[PDB]
Amino acid sequence: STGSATTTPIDSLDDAYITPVQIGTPAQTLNLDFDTGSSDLWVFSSETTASEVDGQTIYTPSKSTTAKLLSGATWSISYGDGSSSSGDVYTDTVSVGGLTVTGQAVESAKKVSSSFTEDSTIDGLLGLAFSTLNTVSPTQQKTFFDNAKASLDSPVFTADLGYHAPGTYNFGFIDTTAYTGSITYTAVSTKQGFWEWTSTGYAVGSGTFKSTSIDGIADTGTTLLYLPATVVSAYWAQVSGAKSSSSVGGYVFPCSATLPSFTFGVGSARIVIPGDYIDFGPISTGSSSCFGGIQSSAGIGINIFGDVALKAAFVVFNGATTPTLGFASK
Template identity: 35%
Template sequence: MLEHVLLLTIWAISACGAPSPSGLGGRFHIDQVHNRNARRNGPVEYAFAHAKYHAPIPKGLSKTMAAIKKVNINAGNATGEVPSWPQELDIEYLSPIMVGEPAQMVWMNLDTGSSDTWMYASTTGEGHKGDQKFYAPEVSKTSTHVPNTSWWIEYGDGTYASGDVWKDTLSIGDVEIKNMTIQTALMASVAMVTDVNMSGLAGLCPNHPSTVMPSQPTLLEKLEPVLDEFVFAADLRYQDTGRFRFGHVPKSDYEGEIHWARMNKTSKFWQFDINSVHVGGTNILLQSTWSFIADTGTTLMLLPMDLTKMYYDQVPGAEYNEWYDSYTFPCNETKNLPSWDFQIAGLNGTVPGHYIAYTNVTEKLCYGGIQPWSAETYGFGILGDVFLKAVYAVFDVQNKTVGFANKKVRA
């Protein structure tokens, strides 16, 4: 699944403590804890986003990815709170979730850009899983196999996972979801297997059906009768503890008011419009309507070319690098990067410049957290974690709206 999983070594996080349940029925939150030992790889994240949305990977980036793969192959020898450990620095967030009776803990990636809930299992074939914690349905007293049902996920870069389907109890903190659809992997590509921490993925996409055939209820559909309010929020943080909250959105989590944007009626994703964009420190302002999706499973901000170019035109020495098919800039400009200011449904918000300084690609060359995307072709741009760390994002499933509020951000 995740292209960056193939290329970057993921280390188990042993310093973090166990989750401590607390809270009220029908609402819970999942904390996120920053992994300071992990690494970033901008081109890998950019390629993964293309693969996830079945977009052709640009020629230069494709060659770069092939070279990186070759190097790695040759070197390859309701109620409760649960901590979540991000992998690869700020890139991937894992949450411990319990499955079955007696409870088995698995580490899941919460993804608002997907609807599948799948995990490695005892039935996963040899060579198709690594040392991840996995689900063993045969030892659960509450598991039931769903006959004549299967699933298959394939990404644009050729990575895949597939398998069969079970029903079992899924527990997050003290919240129990009975007869949850559990997609167990019988096969998975090498790119997934090399992620030594991730047990699977929990999809939170609203209108996109899962890949299970015949169709089965998704995680959001099963959460609806359990939650006090059919809503969840993502409070991601820059190099700091963040949080997913389900069932309730307290005012203490954010500043001011939540501004609500109506979801695109025909979209399968959390899609909404941005009304204006301004690059900090300049008088350049574009007023138009751009459509975006909020995706916790994508790292970068992927913008239409006009917005991307407008930003990097304000960064001395920044250029479009044909080797990566991406924008890079001199690392000595990192502390001077302008902010990316926006307006959504009347909310004026800011992504600080240092959030956009994503990572080094060489000693002197840095990779930007804003990159171009063919929004005209795909109908939307993608606002991933670089953007979401700067806002409080609320996903209202019941009312089909996405809300944004300001919050204190890390300087």
């Protein structure tokens, strides 16, 4: 089997992407944030504290003839941006882009933190990291991909995120029309539960490529590209007037600037992030200070190849017995 679903930016900045997901019988379609940096499929629901729901579409398990309470199971997750959610668990039928999994753990939120409430466009998350990170207790549950894998034509999914445009998540096949050149595959460590890999270096604009190993994670659920302070400083040094602002929380730059590209290495291959992808717009409405899309990972504890990086590529998440990651230009 295969599936193919369009993923759509939630706003004009590509802050995140939502993908429609069918849950239950009859289907309840929720728009979920596919997140290769976590491993829980959780949804706003009829169980979510009413004051914490503001415009989201909810899953109502009592209206699904295939929903079953997973007795005794609870979940609770905290993300790198400080947001969190928790609740109980149902199993139900879940379909993405025509690919159906029966008995998928659907984690129903009883509580969500303010950032989730405040984002009316995201009805929940669909985790695509390794199931070892799944938070369901006392019986850990599998991700949608893990459950689907054996049925897939090939044990892969691909992320093809758009810049200010829709893109695609495919399951079970590689669309050879969706990228240019070849896909370069690179090793993955699953030791931390992430799609963790090592970039071979970087370049800023038309500058020379610096060969240096940068371990980080391919994380569709993180907006920006978080890299070591040395790398980030080298990038922003090429933008007149750019500076790190403690008050704003990162590098900012004059909105009048034209940003240089940023290249990262995948083996001997190179992925170029155009400068415009690195512009996250005014820090506050009407400001002429703009927020940068490349930020320091110092004090995160890990480098993160988030959407800024991934949307410059066609990315293969190869879930074979030994997982790997592939990147192609597009």
